[PDB]
Amino acid sequence: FLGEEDIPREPRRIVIHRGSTGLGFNIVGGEDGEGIFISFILAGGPADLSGELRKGDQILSVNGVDLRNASHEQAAIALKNAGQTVTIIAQYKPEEYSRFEANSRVDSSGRIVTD
């Protein structure tokens, strides 16, 4: 049923209450204003438990801090230091994401496939 509904490409706000634990996702990018993308969400982590982030999401800001143009290290810092309640604005950018992962491409619903 769900898998040929388009994934929304509009910006979303996501609030994650993780205390003084990890957010539970990894990021890639951040060279030359390339952008910061979620690459891996850990099963069972706070980011997974939210239900509102996926691989291919761009992190557009964290607690009001704009990361579209962040470096990789400074995004990671922002993320780790964001505090207990972390307000992300994300936007799913599957074509952009797919250029980081090998053999991966974007289907008609906008889902990222890896062959």
């Binding site: 990890g22 957010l23 539970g24 996702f25 990894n26 990021i27 890639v28 690459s39 891996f40 850990l42 990789h72 290290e73 990671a76 993320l79 780790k80």
Partner: peptide, 6 residues
């Protein structure tokens, strides 16, 4: 390179 877990 690079991917960082947060």
């Amino acid at each position: 390179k690079k991917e960082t877990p947060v």
